[PDB]
Each structure stands twice: as C-alpha cells, then as structure tokens.
C-alpha cells in the first residue's frame, strides 16, 4: 500500500505526473496516513511539481478538515518566501484550493497570508500578486477584509522596474476591482493618472482593466472570440 504509493510519487515528481496524481486521488478515495505524509514531506523537501501536485491531488479527496489545513499551511509558507519557477504556480493554486475547502481555520489562514503578501508588495512582488489573486479567486469574501492597504501596496509595486511583475499586479488588481464592482474608483484613477504623467505597459494595463470593468460590452466579444 505504501511502497506503490511511494514509487508512484517519485515517478510523478521526476503526462506521467498528471496520471499518477489522478490514480492516487482515485486510490485514496477508494480506500497508511503516516506513509502518505512522509512521502509528501520528502517530495516537498526535494520534485517541486510532483510534491505540490500530490498535495493538491490529496486535497479535497482524503477529507482533511483542520489537521490537514495546519500541515499544508506550514508547507505553503515555505514556498511563498522564494518565487520558484512556473511549477511553483501550481503550489499557490494548491494553497488556494486548500483554502477554498471551507474549513474553520481557512479564515485565519487567509488573513495571515494577506498580511504577509502585503509586506512583500522580482521574487517577492510577483509571488505576492499571484498569491493574492489565488486567495481572491478561492475566497473572494476573505479578500475584502483588507482592500485599502492592498490598493496602496499595488500602486507602489506596479511602479517597480519589471515586465512580468505588472502582469500579475494587473490581474490581482482586476480581481480586486471585480469583487468590489460585484458588491476605490477615485483612488485608482488618480494613481493611474499620476504614473501616466518601463512606464508604458504598466500604465496601459491599469487603464485597460478600468475600461473593461466600466464597459463590459467589448469583453463579451473577446470572450466569444476566444471560445471560437
């Protein structure tokens, strides 16, 4: 039971990874706990894509309510400090998926993550934008606890000399703007105008988000074109 699971985890870490995660999730649902935790810890310590995928696959299948939330919280903060390669984006998504399970400690974990991400706001600003977007997508209600500091932090992080950092900041700002519009407009317009007067793509991206939010007529055409 444990030897096969350990062998499958190593094979997935090093389409094979996706197949192993699906098989492990099916096997876990059909059905030991200590062996899975030790294998996950070894995968997380060592590789990076396999450990995050295995944790994400086991999330929402085994049924961890609070015990699994605490263990995943420590692991999630371990990979948050350093912005690893594109594989680490799955780990942030896995953290968001775990935070969206609806646990008692999910509200406290989201608040702690938001405060940590605000300090970070390019291995820190870019990671914070993706983490903030993941939290907003998974828990839009929890992302509205502190929205004023997020806008101020985003207005300063988007001015940094980077290219892909503003891409995540625009997406994070758009997600925050979408949540606000679903239920700050003056601050966003003034901040964009101040930066408008390196500073080319960022200014247009902020303006594009405001235009799409203000008028959704053109957004439907873009969505229809993408689908077709």
């Amino acid at each position: 039971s444990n030897v096969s699971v350990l062998q499958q985890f190593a094979s997935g870490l090093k389409r094979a990874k996706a197949a192993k995660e699906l098989q492990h999730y099916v096997t876990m649902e059909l059905r030991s706990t200590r062996f899975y935790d030790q294998l996950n810890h070894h995968i997380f310590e060592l590789e990076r894509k396999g450990g995050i995928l295995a944790i994400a696959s086991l999330i929402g299948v085994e049924g961890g309510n609070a015990t699994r939330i605490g263990r995943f919280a420590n692991y999630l903060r371990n990979l948050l400090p350093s912005n690893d390669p594109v594989v680490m984006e799955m780990a942030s998504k896995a953290i968001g998926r775990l935070a969206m399970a609806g646990d008692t400690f999910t509200a406290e974990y989201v608040e702690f993550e938001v405060k940590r991400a605000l300090e970070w706001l390019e291995g820190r600003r870019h990671a914070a934008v993706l983490v903030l977007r993941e939290l907003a997508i998974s828990v839009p209600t929890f992302f509205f606890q502190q929205v004023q500091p997020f806008f101020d932090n985003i207005f300063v992080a988007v001015w940094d000399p980077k290219q892909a950092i503003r891409e995540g900041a625009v997406a994070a700002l758009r997600a925050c703007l979408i949540l606000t519009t679903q239920r700050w407009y003056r601050h966003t317009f003034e901040e964009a105008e101040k930066g408008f007067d390196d500073r080319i793509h960022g200014a247009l991206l902020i303006l594009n988000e405001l235009v799409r939010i203000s008028s959704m007529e053109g957004e439907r055409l873009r969505e229809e074109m993408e689908e077709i």
């Binding site: 290219q163 407009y185 408008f196 247009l204 303006l207 405001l210 235009v211 008028s215 873009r222 077709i228």
Partner: protein, 289 residues
C-alpha cells in the same frame, strides 16, 4: 461614474502615447493594441482613423499581427460605418496570406469582423486552402448561423473539402465537421463504415462511432432501409468485439432511445444480448437500459 467622467482625457492620453510610441516601445505595442479595442468600444472620425492606421502599421509588424487582428475586429463590431470601407484592407492583407499557406489569428479576425454579403463569396476559397482547423470550422459555422447569406456555398465548400479529405489524425477533424452540424448523403455513410474496420488508431475510432449515429438521420421505400440496416450492423459488432471498452462505451451510448424501431431486429438483438455479460460494469449498465 468616475471612469465615464475622465474618459475623453484618458482617450486623448492613450492616443498620444500610441502616436508617439510608434516604434520606440513589444510590451507597449501589445498593451497599446489591447487598449485600443477598449477605447474604441467605450469612446466611438479622427480617433477611429488613427487607431486603424496604427493597427494597420502593426498588422505587418512582427509579434503584433495577432494582437492587431483582434483589435481591428473589435473596432469593426463597435461601428459598422467606421470599418465599412476599411475592411477591404484586412481582406486584401488576408487575401494572399491564406493562399501562401500564424493562421489562427487570421480566422479570429474574420469571425470578429463578420459580426457586406458579397465579400464572403470569394473569401471562402482562401480560407478553404488555409487548413482544416477547429477555429476555421467554428468561425465558418458561426458565420453560417448568424448570417446565412449563401448557405449552399458554405455547404459546397465544406462538403468538397470533406470529400477529398476522406478520399485518401487530421482526417478525424473532417469527420467531426460532418457530424458537428447539419449538412446537405448515402455515399458518405457507406464509406464511413470502412475507417474503423481498417484504421488501427483508437482515437479515430472514438469519433468514427460517434459520427455514424448522427449521420444516420434519414430514419417507406426499399432503397434506404437496406443501407441503414447495414451500417447499423457494423457498429453493433464493433461495440462488443473491440479491445478497449472506451470505444465500446461510446458505441452503445450513441444508440440511444431514438433507434427503438431499428434495434428490434432479431439479428440486431443477438448483438445486444452479448453485451449483458460484459467484464466491465459501465457497459452492462448501458446494455440493460
């Protein structure tokens, strides 16, 4: 509210940046093209002409044709009079671009610009030789449903390409097209019973089973009853003697309630009776129903 108040100023500022940063800044060029469609829809002729010229300049530029193609289509949808005479530049640019064959954005621009009836008459030929892609089929299907100007011409072009494609994985798309939406057919279904009997590809067989049931729509003359009963036999045998259940599962799923009057034949019944004693439950559950 707030955005609608400071909209002309933003449009004026956006126009200045695009006009000034013409060849100075790929990040800004990608952002400028995206921002233009947002400005064109929200703020609708000096602005339109400048935006079209900037899009036209970036249309031939590298790493910007795909962005410009979507931007031009968005502007055309916002105002039909603004792109009434300026659409020919897009058509002329894509006239020799398709015959020469990157092509994914070409179909998207046409689909976005489509949503007057004489330009699509000759434009079908360049699109036909562009290639057999789902985007091309989806765009053509959308044009036919939204604007059925020449339904036969779109049907003739699709049928002609389908006939020659099956004459000799890429073929699976052509089979999908015939079974995707309605067409204007007993010669196809007879040869359609040959692909899954000879091709060893499992993927082509999955679509082969699906298209046979949907293409059997003509279901009191003893000329079509014989042929429909023949093509039904092939699927029934395949659905029980196939190695993997994935092909078998879709065969019986296609044979839905509608074929109640066609599955009652004694020879056909023996095919179904075997499926009750099957190794996997997913087929047994379908067979008993």
């Amino acid at each position: 509210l707030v955005e609608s108040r400071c909209c002309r100023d933003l449009m004026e500022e956006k126009f200045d940046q695009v006009c000034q940063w013409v060849l100075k800044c790929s990040l800004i060029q990608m952002t400028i093209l995206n921002l233009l469609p947002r400005l064109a829809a929200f703020r609708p002729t000096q602005y339109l002409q400048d935006t079209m010229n900037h899009v036209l300049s970036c249309v031939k530029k590298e790493k910007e044709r795909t962005a410009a193609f979507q931007a031009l289509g968005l502007l055309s949808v916002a105002v039909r009079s603004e792109f009434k005479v300026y659409l020919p530049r897009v058509l002329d640019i894509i006239r020799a671009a398709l015959p020469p064959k990157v092509d994914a954005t070409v179909f998207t621009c046409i689909s976005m610009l489509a949503r007057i009836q004489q330009d699509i008459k000759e434009l079908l030929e360049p699109m036909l030789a562009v290639g057999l892609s789902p985007a091309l089929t989806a765009v053509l299907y959308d044009l036919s449903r939204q604007i059925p100007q020449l339904k036969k011409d779109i049907q003739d072009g699709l049928l002609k390409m389908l006939s020659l494609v099956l004459m000799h994985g890429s073929i699976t798309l052509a089979l999908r097209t015939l079974g995707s939406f309605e067409f204007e057919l007993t010669q196809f279904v007879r040869h359609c019973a040959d692909h899954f009997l000879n091709s060893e590809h499992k993927e082509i067989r999955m679509e082969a089973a699906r298209t046979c049931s949907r293409l059997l729509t003509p279901s009191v003359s003893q000329t079509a009853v014989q042929v429909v009963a023949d093509v039904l036999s092939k699927l029934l045998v395949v659905g029980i003697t196939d190695p993997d259940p994935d092909i078998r599962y879709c065969v019986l799923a296609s044979l839905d309630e509608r074929f109640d009057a066609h599955l009652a034949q004694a020879e056909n019944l023996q095919a179904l009776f075997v499926a009750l004693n099957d190794q996997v439950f997913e087929i047994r559950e379908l067979a008993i129903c």
